Amino acid sequence: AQYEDGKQYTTLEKPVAGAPQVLEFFSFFCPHCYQFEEVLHISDNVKKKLPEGVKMTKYHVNFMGGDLGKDLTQAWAVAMALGVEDKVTVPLFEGVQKTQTIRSASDIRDVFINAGIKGEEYDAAWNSFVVKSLVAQQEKAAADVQLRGVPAMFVNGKYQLNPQGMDTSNMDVFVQQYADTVKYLSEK
């Protein structure tokens, strides 16, 4: 076939029931994740080709960046809880990897506030039940798929995208093939 198990994607030994249709794992403290998002724009490309009714979810991992990595995972939970993911993704990536302006939890807070989120609102969300739950969900999902590295993407909690098996003869062909594979897999 055009797409085959072993090439563009691998199948998980134990399928995760009730997992998000398309789950992506990343970290702001991850160089390849920066390229994946900010440079190559793999996510946006994948989203653009997803079938009707298929949604994409992005979880942050906590095993990178030490304590700040932990704080960034909770801050990401806040972003999801408040629905402001697309307002903070860029400043967080740039601030962490490019300009090196984000070095603590309070620096992260400044980023959200500058983005339009009121301080009280952020602080409320930070200590909320929804956020505590989200933090736990993110780590649990990573464990369910036996995640050891990011960036990574899973479809229907059964397939894992395998970039190493894709056509990497050109930056554009790679990106397009990645998006096409996710689309193909979600129709299963």
Q: Any idea where the domains of the chain sit in the sequence?
A: 1-188
In the structure encoding, which two tokens stand for residue 37, read together?
Answer: 């998002």
Amino acid at 55: K
Structural fold of domain 1-188: Glutaredoxin (3.40.30)
CA dihedral 21, 3, 32, 82 (to 10 degrees): -10
Of residues 181, 188, 187, the one with CA closest to residue 4: 181
Q: Which residue's structure tokens are 């929804």?
A: 130
- In 38-171, beta strands by DSSP E: 56-60, 152-155, 159-161
**What does the radius of gyration of the chain's CA atoms come to, in whole angstroms?**
17
- Integer Cα distance of 184 and 2 in angstroms: 10
User: From CA 149, how far away is CA 10, in angstroms rounded?
Assistant: 15
Closest to 114 in 3D by CA, of 134, 98, 143, 92: 92
- Cross-strand pairs, 24: 58, 153
Are 19 and 25 spatial neighbours (Cβ–Cβ below 8 Å)? no
Q: How far is CA 77 from CA 81, 149, 177, 183, in A?
A: 6, 20, 30, 26
CA distance linking residue 160 with residue 147, whole number of Å: 10
What angle (nearest 5°) sits at the alpha carbon of residue 150, between those of residues 79 and 158?
Answer: 90
23 forms beta bridges with 57, 154
The pair of three-digit structure tokens given for residue 114, joined into one six-digit string: 């500058």
Q: Say if residues 181 and 8 touch (Cβ distance below 8 Å).
A: yes
Nearest to 135, CA basis, from 70, 58, 88: 70
- On whether the CB atoms of residues 156 and 21 are closer than 8 A, the answer is yes
Q: Supply the DSSP symbol for 7.
A: T
Contacts of 179 (CB under 8 A, 6+ apart): 42, 45, 46, 48, 49
Q: What is the resolution of this structure in A?
A: 2.0
Dihedral of alpha carbons 162, 159, 133, 42, sign: positive
What is the rounded CA–CA span in Å between residue 9 and residue 58? 19
**DSSP SS3 for 35:** helix
